[PDB]
Amino acid sequence: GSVIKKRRKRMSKKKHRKLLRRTRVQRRKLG
Amino acid sequence: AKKALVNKAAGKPRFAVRAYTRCSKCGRPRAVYRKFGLCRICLREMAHAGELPGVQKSSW
C-alpha cells in the first residue's frame, strides 16, 4: 500500500494549491 | 417446573376435571404424553438412552 503515502502528500499539496488560488490577490499579494 | 406445582399435580385436586399431567421426570406442564407420562424432551433423551423399552428411530 505504498500509494497511500502518495495520496496523503497529494491531498496536502492539493489543499495548499487551493489556498494559494483562493489567495493570489491582495488577500495574499499585499502580504 | 415449580415444586409446589409438581406437588399439586401429584395430589388429588377437587373437581376431577381440574386434574392434569406433568412430566414424570422434570415436571414440565406441556408436551406431556399419556402412554409415556413423560414430556417431549425427557422422552427424547430417555429413549436415546434406551432406558425405556420398545423405542427406536424410524425411516420409511
Binding site: - | 417431549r40 422422552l43 427424547r44 429413549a47 423399552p53 423405542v55 428411530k57 424410524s58
Partner: protein
Amino acid sequence: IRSPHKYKDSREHFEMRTHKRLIDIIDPTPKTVDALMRIDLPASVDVNIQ
C-alpha cells in the same frame, strides 16, 4: 421437537413395534398342563392361555 425451545422445523421420530405370534397346540394331555405352566419364559415375552 428436538430443541427445548423455538425450533418447529426440526423433529425426531420414535416408534414402537409389538410383534404377535400364535402356536395353537392341539392335543390335550393332563400331564403337560403343569409342563406348560413351568416354563422359563424370556424377560420381554408375555404369554396368554385361551
